[PDB]
């Protein structure tokens, strides 16, 4: 301990010690000395290992990924790197000794403790533990789960505890498994990473790596079996409960979606014991299995660590007009874990993508399975619920698989994971335990997700990405002390020209190759020059409305001093949703589009919403990544399905006659909003007929042309515009769905969501019951508002119509102040603090009439 | 359930049922009927076993030794005595299913409950548990230890808890093991304790007793190993702590006879983890092993 933790200004001492051990370990010419040295070395290494574990358990893992890795622990790694083949063996034994008290269910209860943040306060605890004399001889005298899984949780639909200590031992076990994997990771490079790094270290060879790997696998089999058997049993119980939820009647009070002391407790216990006894023989067909997952935190830690090991091994293993062409392949968000596509030419568009079928189906906390359509030891599913039968089957399956270096230098070492299954790749296991994983990916994210590179964060939905979004956008905002100020009219024509001109004067007088990072974005209206946030929200709204209008533009050439008057955007296909209209493709138009891209970057940088509802292929291009056949469903679902039907017809026995009868050629009509007329998909395309054999090219070119070629210059302009404000790295987290939640927020005003973010303040002096009745009245009116009237309400209350898609979306929070009783006055809202103030109206009718009249007086003054 | 617990003034019904099962189990001259009857019988017996366990767990054991043995449970014993060779096998499986959630360390936490003193209040709890419809388809639309051992106890020298549920499952397991033993106890006298007691029961033979005993032993080996290994480990830790108490100096404040929040708790946990790691390789020569016995209530029952 003291040599490592307390020589806080030295390292040559430790190096000398290691050099001595290495020299004597190589003293082969002296009899017995070899074995003596090995015995000495091992006895030292176990002491090093204790010091290492104690330190590693105390120091809290930095949630920002940092190389703080304090020098005590760095020194430990140096020892293990220098003495590798021995270090591995002793580490197995420390790992084994740490897990058994939990794996047998024996361990002591303890109170909890905070992990230590500073190096100093981490180190001090170990001093008081190693500053000890032997006893003298006698003197000479947890984010909450979705409804499809809530029934499986003990939830509401210091003292010691056993579970504390069971969990912390699993936490500690994971560390050692990672470290063993890391050391196995160094082996191929070792003939370089010895001599280029450390004065002395043990020589080792391919033959030794084999035997180390043999040894390491064996020591993991018991904990592996224990993990696997419990996981299979859990996944089975979850999937069965879901199938029953589908087949059963939600009107019944015992349905999973619908749902005293001693006797209720004896009820709970008896329900559990009866469910246990039933489950063993599959006598459990028509009631939910009794289960809680919150106890299973220790298997969550162990599972996470055991994947770490296999994942590392896999990194050592890896080191047309066909329907198989990349255009037709499923894309980002669509390719499920270890899954194979429901083929879009065999499956209806309506069914292949329920989100592309129904665009308003997207929610922040919807399960990914909905939006893109629901998808040997691993091939057979977790069918049995019983624990015991799974364990027995696991062991039988394991029995099925049971039933200088010459040649390779270390750089050529070809390890893998091959036992328990013949090949494991982690995608398969993410396929097998899919629901257990997703549930852990909500419940345990704060804790098991804090492990370095914890596989739970890969199941991280919208909010995980948004947690990074605030940190990055606020970091980009706070690095600059220079504002953006825009003074504009409310008139559509003046608004567009003035906004774009001032953005060019701001952009061009700052370096045009550096992102427009700003401190604050401030907006003032002419004849209403109120300023800052709510005014700027009203502006983002109004400027978006100006671009989406079907009225003719003013001459955009006015923007160059800082006619192509076609409307800026149109709705392609049979969506309510927009793509840029190319107009006459003049530079003035592209200049305008490049400024519009800047507006997206600015709103996001400020965490402010921009109500511009762009199509998926447009957004993929803005993100700078590839567009596929599936995005043509987001261009035009009716045309995508008609071309799917055309492909189904190419698979019909009369395809040559049907394609002759349709009279199709490689030329397409464009609407006026796409530039008009008839355009050839390939040169001479009017004279080239579509046949059942060339149709795959025709459908490809049709889709590619309509999504990209028609708008390539507007798209090039807007993307440049976004990069003019924000750095490229910020795009890398996102698919179009995520970008939608951040840019547009929740367009659907979910009243329960708005309730949860709303606070009520009272200035009226009236009693809590009248206040609660008035609060009920208000929400019952907002519930009865049409979605438009709700959007107008939030626009009145905040100067933006969409709800932010989270608590993190609000800056500041929405609030309602109840003022003293008045039936004459209207409700009024300071949108620059997003706060509404309402009189205590004498009746629900007056509250409704006054509220609706206020939000429908759309001429809002910029308070 | 209802035939056994709620016919509180009759027994001939149950006897008729058993006589019918026995007759058909002896219908050897009819093809297939034999195996059909065995399958039927087993499926009935597991239901009897659930009814029996539920009742046995609720009724508090009378601390004055009394033959109150309320008639529901007496009837259960009558069934198992009449169908002995089959009853034994199904009882093994119920025992096995009850212990595994504890023996793997998995089981749910629960609040505690009082065992029921009266027959009536014991019986009522089972009614509300068996008065149930399947879910419909979607419509068409502790005296304190002496000083030589006190150091080994977590002591001072409703909410749910894991340990409650771990303990009560062990309590429940013991009942079934006793009942299996009792039935094995009847076997020698059976050629008298059938015909002198009950209108009908299964014929059985020495060869069958052998095979039953083989089966019963196998089903106990896992829990036996688990019990033995923990007990040996515990006894070792206790005896070593005593030997050290003899050789050491009681003047030292760390002697077993002589003896802040978060950091003290992290102290306790680290002392435990360090004692665990030391103990694995006999690197533990001069400090007391960190231990508490109060958790081990489930191995005590087993």
Numbering used by the authors:
A (entry chain B): 1385 to 1525, 1707 to 1722, 1773 to 1874, 1908 to 1967, 2015 to 2070, 2093 to 2120, 2160 to 2318, 2499 to 2799
B (entry chain A): 1385 to 1525, 1707 to 1722, 1773 to 1874, 1908 to 1950
Task: Provide passages from the article that reported this PDB entry.
Here, we used genetic screens to identify the HECT-family protein ubiquitin protein ligase E3 component n-recognin 5 (UBR5) as the E3 ubiquitin ligase that governs agonist-induced degradation of numerous NRs and characterized these interactions biochemically and structurally. We next structurally interrogated functional domains in the context of full-length UBR5, which is expressed predominantly as a 310 kDa polypeptide product in humans. The N-terminal region of UBR5 arranges into a seven-bladed β-propeller, which shows weak homology to a regulator of chromosome condensation 1 (RCC1)-like domain (RLD). Following the RLD, a large helical region forms the core scaffold of UBR5.
To unambiguously assign this weaker density, we expressed and purified a mutant version of UBR5 lacking residues 522–720 (UBR5Δtandem), which in SEC-MALS was consistent with a dimer (648 kDa). In cryo-EM analysis the dimeric UBR5Δtandem is held together solely by the rigid interface in the central helical bundle (bottom, S4A, and S4B). Reduced orientation bias of the dimeric UBR5 particles allowed us to generate an improved map at ~3.4 Å resolution. One dimerization interface is maintained through a large central helical bundle (residues 1,350–2,110), which is among the highest resolution regions of the EM map. The insertion following the 2nd blade is largely unobserved in our EM reconstructions and is predicted to be unstructured, except for the 50 amino acid region that folds into a classical UBA domain. The other insertion between the 5th and 6th blades forms the aforementioned dimerization interface (residues 522–720). The eponymous UBR domain, a small motif containing three zinc ions, protrudes from this central region and is also clearly observed in the cryo-EM density map. As in other HECT-family ubiquitin ligases, the catalytic HECT domain of UBR5 is found at its extreme C-terminus. We observe an additional density from an upstream region (residues 2,022–2,067) wedged into a hydrophobic surface on the HECT N-lobe, promoting a predominant L-shaped conformation of the HECT domains. This region, which we refer to as the “wedge”, is poised to influence conformational dynamics of the HECT domain over a catalytic cycle and also scores as one of the top hits in our tiling screen (residue 2,050). The EM density maps have been deposited at the Electron Microscopy Data Bank database with accession code EMD-17539 (UBR5 dimer), EMD-17540 (UBR5 tetramer), and EMD-17542 (negative stain map of UBR5 dimer with RARA/RXRA).
